[PDB]
Design a protein around this ligand. Sequence first.
Ligand SMILES: O=C(O)CCC(=O)C(=O)O
Ligand SMILES: [Mn+2]
Length: 221
Amino acid sequence: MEEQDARVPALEPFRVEQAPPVIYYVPDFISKEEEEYLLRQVFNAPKPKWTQLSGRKLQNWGGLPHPRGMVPERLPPWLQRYVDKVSNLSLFGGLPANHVLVNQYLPGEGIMPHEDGPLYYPTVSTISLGSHTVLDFYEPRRPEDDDPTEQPRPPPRPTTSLLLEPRSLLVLRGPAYTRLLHGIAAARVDALDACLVRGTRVSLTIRRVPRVLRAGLLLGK
Ligand SMILES: O=C(O)CCC(=O)C(=O)O
Ligand SMILES: [Mn+2]
């Protein structure tokens, strides 16, 4: 039922059939002119919009997701345009997305394997800009599968990897959101067999945050 409910009829021509349920990959979701304008607006944002992490830089737009409730911020039109385009595919349970995470990866930067978790409706939509990357998928270790007497097992390798080209839309739903981990290796090149050199990548991850505080209300803790 999880897989059945996760299907989006309008995107079925874009289903990645050999990947876990349910992954869509739409090439050329945005034009080169649209890509250029998004890069310009990310790069020209006020310095304080940027957060420096150990292995990448990012921007939050729409507010900072939090388990006690998100304090919302108005999305600017240059992002709302694409929030509207992905929300029109009805990817977020029948309410529009309300949050954009911008990640910037210089060549050699990535993101450790993770699941996006319960702060979001269980759907990732990502518009890639600037450079290709490879997104790796891993089977999680579930507590119900824990065997403290198991034979030696090789270090985890990805179960599937997907090339993400600039101007593509990626959608992860069902088990691809709730069961699998995804990550990007800290690499300068991706061998397909032939081989792609990474430039700077900027990704726009568009999600719906269901726990939002009314305008003006703060929670401590
Ligand atoms: O940059 C990407 O496409 C993935 C980012 C991501 O997985 C995340 O920020 O949760
Ligand atoms: Mn993620």
